[PDB]
């Protein structure tokens, strides 16, 4: 997989180049954000079961057909596999957040997921609503200031919510 420092090395090599001082100076701007990026994945990991079950509870309150007899999240083995899917997607968005780009999310999670749900009969447009409810549960948690020094991590909030958007358009 690639991280954000390995994505610039692969672009540079493909043209047989060194890295200029302008490119190095933009990679040490990525290092200085290093402790605020680690606080964001720590807040998502530490609350990871309340992200998943509060947003699954919300998903069936407003789409109650999914848990009725004949639905897809009916019959508790399929209920447990439904919550497994939300923890899986939340796991790889957490991986793509420390890496700095979404390549481990792209081929280990989302690659072939839209075509998997069509072979199972799972509503892939309702999985995207499940990802979108974990999106703002995780954003409201990362904007929350508890346990953190004063300062700024607002360009990183907009980045974490973009991996949740990538995961949600790849499944519809």
């Amino acid at each position: 997989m690639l991280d954000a420092f390995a994505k610039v090395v692969a672009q540079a090599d493909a043209r047989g180049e060194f890295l200029s001082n302008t490119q190095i100076d933009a990679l040490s701007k990525m290092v200085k954000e290093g402790n605020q990026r680690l606080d964001i994945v720590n807040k998502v990991t530490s609350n990871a079961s309340a992200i998943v079950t509060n947003s699954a509870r919300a998903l069936f309150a407003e789409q109650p057909q999914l848990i009725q007899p004949g639905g897809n999240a009916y019959t508790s083995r399929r209920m447990a596999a439904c919550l497994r899917d939300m923890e899986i997607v939340l796991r790889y968005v957490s991986y793509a957040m420390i890496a700095g780009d979404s390549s481990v999310l792209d081929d280990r999670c989302l690659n072939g997921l839209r075509e998997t749900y069509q072979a199972l009969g799972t509503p892939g447009s309702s999985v995207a609503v499940a990802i979108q409810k974990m999106k703002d549960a995780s954003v409201a948690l990362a904007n929350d200031t508890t346990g953190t020094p004063i300062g700024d991590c607002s360009s990183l909030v907009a980045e974490l919510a973009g991996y949740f958007d990538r995961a949600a358009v790849s499944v519809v």
Partner: protein, 231 residues
Amino acid sequence: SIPILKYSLSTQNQRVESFEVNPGDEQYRIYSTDSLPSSSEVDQIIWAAYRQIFSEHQILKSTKQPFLESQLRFNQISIKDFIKGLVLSAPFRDLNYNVNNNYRFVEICVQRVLGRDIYNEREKIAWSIIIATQGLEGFIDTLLNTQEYLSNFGDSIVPFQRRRIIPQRSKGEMPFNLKTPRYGIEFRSKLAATQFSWASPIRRFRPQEQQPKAGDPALFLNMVQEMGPGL
């Protein structure tokens, strides 16, 4: 005595060498009892074997084999017997063998026990008659006793998807659990409690997916949280 019928090979990644001394992050984590693991590390061998044979979605409490686990912790069975014992297990016959036919069950067990894709369609045809005439217990024994299994994994390594990513690349072949789920486009129709087979995206009058434009004050919001110190 009815030998297996002959099929043709195909070009695949694992048939040919990667010249890779010092593998990287896509090396796929040998789980072996040849490293003498403790109790905390033999739990990781067991979870890796459950993930490989079952899905991640079939590692429920009602699925786990507690007595096959304790014979591995006492050095009575090998990892090749743990992998055989998971395929002949009652959860695997109920959730996977009963909702596939004989041709799609071969390609599940080739992908998950041998760690490679099928060569062609005739390889599914060639192996699906080992199931129908000898059972699952005869099919998994003639599949674990091939030279493809005993050379790659031996009898003390958990199988893995062999040679999935090429060393330069960032996009590799699809993982075998996302490529081949529990049941397919047949058994989907009405044999698995299903309706209507597709769904349009959810409509709403509060749009929820508005893209920001070039003068919006949240793109400059950066240092809005707090001003920097100094003089």
